[PDB]
Design a protein around this ligand. Sequence first.
Ligand SMILES: [Fe+3]
Ligand SMILES: [Fe+3]
Ligand SMILES: [Fe+3]
Ligand SMILES: [Fe+3]
Ligand SMILES: [Fe+3]
Ligand SMILES: [Fe+3]
Ligand SMILES: [Fe+3]
Ligand SMILES: [Fe+3]
Ligand SMILES: [Fe+3]
Ligand SMILES: [Fe+3]
Ligand SMILES: [Fe+3]
Ligand SMILES: [Fe+3]
Ligand SMILES: [Fe+3]
Ligand SMILES: [Fe+3]
Lengths: 287, 287, 287, 287, 287, 287, 287
Amino acid sequence: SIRSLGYMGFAVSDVAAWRSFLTQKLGLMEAGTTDNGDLFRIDSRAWRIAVQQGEVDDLAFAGYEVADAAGLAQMADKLKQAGIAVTTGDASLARRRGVTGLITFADPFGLPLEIYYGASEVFEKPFLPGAAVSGFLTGEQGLGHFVRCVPDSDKALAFYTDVLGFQLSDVIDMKMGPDVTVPAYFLHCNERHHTLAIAAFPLPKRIHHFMLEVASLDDVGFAFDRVDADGLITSTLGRHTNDHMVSFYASTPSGVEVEYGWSARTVDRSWVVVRHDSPSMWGHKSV
Amino acid sequence: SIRSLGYMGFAVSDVAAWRSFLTQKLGLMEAGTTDNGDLFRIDSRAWRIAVQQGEVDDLAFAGYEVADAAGLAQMADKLKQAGIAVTTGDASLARRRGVTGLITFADPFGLPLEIYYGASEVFEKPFLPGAAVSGFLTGEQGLGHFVRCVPDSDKALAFYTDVLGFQLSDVIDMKMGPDVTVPAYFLHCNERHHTLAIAAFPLPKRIHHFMLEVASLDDVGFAFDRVDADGLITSTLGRHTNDHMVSFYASTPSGVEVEYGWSARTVDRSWVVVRHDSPSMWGHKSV
Amino acid sequence: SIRSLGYMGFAVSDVAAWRSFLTQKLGLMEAGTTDNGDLFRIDSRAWRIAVQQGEVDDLAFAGYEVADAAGLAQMADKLKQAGIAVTTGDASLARRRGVTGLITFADPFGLPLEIYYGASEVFEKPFLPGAAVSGFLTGEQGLGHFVRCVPDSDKALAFYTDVLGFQLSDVIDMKMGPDVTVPAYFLHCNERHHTLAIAAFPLPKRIHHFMLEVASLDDVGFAFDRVDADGLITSTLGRHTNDHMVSFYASTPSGVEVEYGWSARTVDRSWVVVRHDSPSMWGHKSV
Amino acid sequence: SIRSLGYMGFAVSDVAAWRSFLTQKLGLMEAGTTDNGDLFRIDSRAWRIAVQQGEVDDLAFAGYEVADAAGLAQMADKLKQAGIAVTTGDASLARRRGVTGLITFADPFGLPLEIYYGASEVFEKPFLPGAAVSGFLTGEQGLGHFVRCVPDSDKALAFYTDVLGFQLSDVIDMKMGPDVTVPAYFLHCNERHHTLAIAAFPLPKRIHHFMLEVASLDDVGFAFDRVDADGLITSTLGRHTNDHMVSFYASTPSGVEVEYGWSARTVDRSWVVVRHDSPSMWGHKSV
Amino acid sequence: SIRSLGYMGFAVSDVAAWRSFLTQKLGLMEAGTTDNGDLFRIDSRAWRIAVQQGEVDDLAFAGYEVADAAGLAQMADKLKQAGIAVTTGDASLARRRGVTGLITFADPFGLPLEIYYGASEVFEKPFLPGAAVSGFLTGEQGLGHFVRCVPDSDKALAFYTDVLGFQLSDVIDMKMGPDVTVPAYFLHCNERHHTLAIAAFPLPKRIHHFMLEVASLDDVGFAFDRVDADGLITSTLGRHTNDHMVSFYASTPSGVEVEYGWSARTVDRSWVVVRHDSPSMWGHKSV
Amino acid sequence: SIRSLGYMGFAVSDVAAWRSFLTQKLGLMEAGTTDNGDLFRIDSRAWRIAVQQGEVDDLAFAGYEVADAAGLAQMADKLKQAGIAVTTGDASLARRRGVTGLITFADPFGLPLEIYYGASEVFEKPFLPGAAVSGFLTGEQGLGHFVRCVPDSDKALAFYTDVLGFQLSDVIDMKMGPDVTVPAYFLHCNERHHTLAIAAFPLPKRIHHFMLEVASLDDVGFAFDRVDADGLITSTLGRHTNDHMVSFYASTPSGVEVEYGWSARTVDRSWVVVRHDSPSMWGHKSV
Amino acid sequence: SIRSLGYMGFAVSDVAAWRSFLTQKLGLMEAGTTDNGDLFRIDSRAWRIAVQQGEVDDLAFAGYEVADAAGLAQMADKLKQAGIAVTTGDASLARRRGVTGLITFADPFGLPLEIYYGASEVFEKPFLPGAAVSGFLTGEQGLGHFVRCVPDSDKALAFYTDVLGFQLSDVIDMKMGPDVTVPAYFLHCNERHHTLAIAAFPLPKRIHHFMLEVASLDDVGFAFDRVDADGLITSTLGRHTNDHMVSFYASTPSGVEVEYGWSARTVDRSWVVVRHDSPSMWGHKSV
Ligand SMILES: [Fe+3]
Ligand SMILES: [Fe+3]
Ligand SMILES: [Fe+3]
Ligand SMILES: [Fe+3]
Ligand SMILES: [Fe+3]
Ligand SMILES: [Fe+3]
Ligand SMILES: [Fe+3]
Ligand SMILES: [Fe+3]
Ligand SMILES: [Fe+3]
Ligand SMILES: [Fe+3]
Ligand SMILES: [Fe+3]
Ligand SMILES: [Fe+3]
Ligand SMILES: [Fe+3]
Ligand SMILES: [Fe+3]
């Protein structure tokens, strides 16, 4: 069973711009360059985000974490019984990712996904942010979340819930005009309100945004000014209706957006699915 | 499995009187008028109480909430296997209620019931009470509770526990005279002491009372004076023996009573069924 | 300096009625009969209330407590410098009261007052209430409070604040009719909102009421029913605007009223004098 | 499944002595006399201990509480499948005990036992102790515990654990002389360290002692002096090695001993069975 | 101003008996032998109790601690202005006591007293008790307390309060027979209820007892059994009425008694002097 | 199911050196000598470590604790179904160990192991350390842990996880030179990060080290100096990367090392297996 | 009145070595270079440590902080009345230091001192350490402390306590050989155990060491390894006897030592002066 989103890899046209953006604007820690690409940290793990040179300028792969080898076996079996082509990652790939074991496959629309266990910790190299950030929230909630854009939401939903095991948190009916309303589905695999969201948005990218959560309001406020100085803000500070995250959105060098937030609520055992007609309580003014 | 009482609808002869009573006396928030009727809020949900014009001057329907679509499927199946006529609510009905999916049916004595999932939240329209009330207690405990009057308690008990899944909290042997003692059964489906009570009381209404729970003693004290000013109090402040609710009772424009309370105790895992010979520890003097 | 109200003595026409009222209705503990009269306890002190046979059917004397012999000396000196006739209580009187040292005198309108130190504790005879009461609130807040009726409030104010050292908490402008408004002054000598209140009310008694504070709402609720059973309630449950005490009032066998309350707020160092136009926030309906 | 020890009944030769001992020495509340005998309370339940006139001067019956009717059915079935003669208590018996339903049977050595559900609460008649006692500890831990003397411990163990479902907490090897060592087995059915203990002690009674637990050390200290005044102490204050109860033992009018304690530790999920060679850490000097 | 009782010295006929009693029964730590005598510790200080060979078999001297050199100067001045013969301790004496500076003098009845500042700490030699004791309570409350027997209490009171600055906590009227009642005065110089008590008891020793306070009830319970094994208990476990200390008394090899207690209450700013007619709430049965 | 490591026995050439090392350096409590050997305590259990005269100068046996007799039966069955030679410990062996029941067998490489239930508690003989130690951490976490050296880690892993039920916490890839990297596997059977670790280290002993955990940093700091005084430190203070234990290592008289630590983190339900490339975050400099 | 040590300035021969040492080893934040020198931060203040090129390779000046202009006036007056040459810092100096007002003078042995008020905060430039450090402890405790070496301790004591107002915390008698014992005096001006210590040590520098306090043990552990890598450790980890600081000492490029610690205890109102014979409880082994 998937425990959380563990890592993400981006294939971008401008690696230097990405390096500067991640460290100086967002405050991630530069963790070296390997055959896995330029590595970035936000906690004790050896890396959480990898940046590789590539033409797509988008999310290249995402890795979901299971607790152990048994968990990996379960998932591989579940994917096979569903008719999904699964490849047992070879030692070389496992080494490049710094994991113990992994399997690779793709979602129904071509996004390369990896399920792994036994990632590397580096407590001996204490995390030091690239900018003043009190801390990032990971732990049992994993890396954060991202919104996957798809041409068919029902097909995507069936795969992510029936095959991968994600559970529905809630739905937001996004009014994208008078004649268009698109439901966005938010899914969880742990306490974090959502680790994955699915929506049929007509975007030129695989994901609408990825999100990183910080420890204090000031972390968000200071980062906003750093990003705003370069004219990269896409949405002012606001609070979402479903996860209650206080955040702003900004544009990365690839056009893909990043959400930088604080104070999201978690999903508990008494949680019930609900629907919303608005994505934000206040703020989040498009700029 | 039913998680809580989610909403209630009343069919009344005087809609204006009801509007004024709910907002000015009890402090509910007016939420607009739709084809679902005049809507009222007590929390983040789009509505909890609907008031429609009707001749019965009584509870018209009650909606029980399940966590998701799977839960809805389970219940529909459970009702069918029991020989109950269930109707899958059509899109039009689902839209009128503001829910994702629902099924309709009736209890053994004709009360229309609905089981649904995916109700609408409106965090973007923050709750503002119609009178000074610090807050209402809902959350995982749902809307509150109501006492269903029935001609046959054993038949009612079998349906609500065996088919709907409610669990018995306790029983109060109501001495309604020298020659008459009527047992009132209190049932729970979550932490709230009781979401439903059943009793063979000879009343001209479907329910003896419905209850709303507030956050502080002052909320109750202030409301008492507001209601008392119009001579609508039916029972002075007191505390019940079973749920330990401190409350007063008042008459709504339909004759049906409302209980407005505070500080009820909850049901835990070590709870055991007990019996009582009195409904109140102190107070609750009939007026 | 006066630390609190320590004890009170009543001279009544019906001692048996008083005994029954104090123990069975209010829950005080019967502490024996001495030359000091029938004694009653509410805590570790040997007695707090004394009931003696007398014709006035009213408060006979009140004792204010100082911390020690130095404190007693200070007060005696303060009274003398003000021209008040002070009598050093003789050993016989000290023994009757169970105190170490005391001085006696009267307020400007004839109420016998005593200031003492070194009262008797009886921890070896644990307090057991005469009725189900979880506990009374005394400690550093003393016995409770009483409202002294006077013909001239300014003369009374000068004596109690300038000579006895009480400090003003607040004032309530009591509208006793279209042509009459009487200010009630509330004074403190410790954390308790008021230990003494002064008002020019046209009553046939020395005090309007005396108050006892209990530990829980249920103590008040149960006592209300006990008193109500005998038709002795004079004012329904309510909460005062100034001390925020939730209480009811009842008639003692002498006609003097008793207030039985819970949850009063205390006076702190940042307290500021304010005025009110109403004595109650809610409730306290005269009956 | 048994949730706790709910009530006990004693058949004694001197009912008046028992009444005085329970109320004045131990502080129980006299709850009236019915066809069930003289009733005594220690909490919200209508009664916990019944005293009836009888020749045995010993424990006459004990009632174990289950959560509901389903629980009662389970136990009846379990006893039947074990070949135990079970009698469904008739309405008359249920009424005498003040319970909803019950079954009666006996342990392998003749002690009448009852398993019931739905006992009566009397919150409207607040508990008032017969002596100064801050409170008794019951709740989910039930009444307390008793040590059953038996001629064959293994036969007794098989019945109480295999049939009744009690779980072993620990064992104390009681050295009753050079040539005699008797193991005492302590069993639990809830958090209370033990609700029942079994030992092959050569006593003329069915039980060695029954125990009541109070809320504070002073409750124990004051009670000790009350009992000691009549020369009824059998064991000085001490603390047990297994349940860590601080207690003293005294003789009841029937010769059966009562343990009055405070501060016992509870059994949790990580509990493991252990053995002891001494019953007390300190104190408990036989007198 | 005196901050606390810092150390005590005993002059005894049997030093070995004292060594064994203090370490094995009471659990003090043996700290070596110097020209100051056999030294014993209960905390971080180099020593708190000194045992020297002597004929009196009694308290030889007591040392009161001031905060600093200024405090020492104040006290010396206060004693001189009172006509008391004060001697500035010489370097040799200061070295023997392990203090920075000290003055010596005697109370009105010949007890040698010392006031000092700058005692020695030995954090580098962590405290290890001679018997199983979780810890002793010292800190700002100092060593503990002792009751000084005197032929004239008023003369003793004047010296200790007017000259030494101790403040009265309370008084206990000790009935030592039909024709004799002796008041015991309890005095404090910090939070500890009393550091010194004065009473005109006809004892052959300078003090009735000295007290040591431990951290848990078990410390007291275990020590009781250790002492009881040698038949040295003089008073069973009990709780005092004034300081609320739960303790037992035992005889030291010199006949002087020691009180070993736990859970005493402290004196605060709102403390008021009171009187008691009994020294104990419960227990403390003379043996 | 195994609940924890309960006891360990060492067979050494110099029993006196071991006695002195354990009590004076580490602070264990000497618990007597029996046919089980010299016994040592760290908590309420009768013994945790046994030292016997022997030629191996190494760990002689280790005992794993199960909750009860059922647990013992389960394990015996599990071992038998795996083809392991199990011997039901005879009464004589059970008596020597002070346990209720036990089974004996060996791990794949000859280490004698015992699984037992019902060990002996000695609350009546309160723990008193041999040196100043505030306390040892045991409870549900058991004795501590040890690292088992093996010639084949996969064979060892299969036995300890598949047969004994231990679960993997994490792995550390120990670089023991340019051409050698050895994975160390850390396993848990309760909250303690690891109760057992397995590694193919080329050591002349059965275990690399055993660990004892204390309650405070000072316990570790003081012990370090005691051990350092004799030149027995093998590794300076440091903190491990996986269990986060702050500790130092020292050499026992047998050459086997002991780790003395504080502040280790525990394993929870959301734990996931990870890998590390370093065994320490800081410190732990080999000396 | 002096509130704390606010800033320090060093005049060194190798500014680059100092820059690298402070940021990379200790983790201070580089704050730019001004006419005040290379500036370093540890909190919200614009700078706490200044490094200037100079020949002394020692502490060049220290600044003590007062609360306001009135405080500055008081101190200037106090110094003048003592005959100390005080210079009112000119606007140019105030600007260079970034303060509102300041006075300059020297201690009896030539150390330039400054007393100022109104230093500059830079909350808009959030603190980011030069190495992984969770945080430094400053606030009301100021920068930290330093030990001033002097030829005459009594002369130094008189100036710092009588003129500057520092209060004595404690004294440590430093045995610097058989024939030499030197008392070190520790003084406080706020909660920090000591802000200044004075000792007649024969060192070639003005101060023995300066200390910086961090927020966690790991901060100390990681820094130790960073410093140890360059062979700069002078004293291993240990805990002091007086302030209870857990720290290590290292050599700065100027030879002056720096103490880097954690978990020091504070001085309260009930503090009393004591003496010690050892500077450390454990550790602090000279290397
Ligand atoms: Fe879920
Ligand atoms: Fe998002
Ligand atoms: Fe339930
Ligand atoms: Fe209700
Ligand atoms: Fe005031
Ligand atoms: Fe009042
Ligand atoms: Fe259990
Ligand atoms: Fe017992
Ligand atoms: Fe005082
Ligand atoms: Fe005492
Ligand atoms: Fe696990
Ligand atoms: Fe280890
Ligand atoms: Fe100070
Ligand atoms: Fe220092």
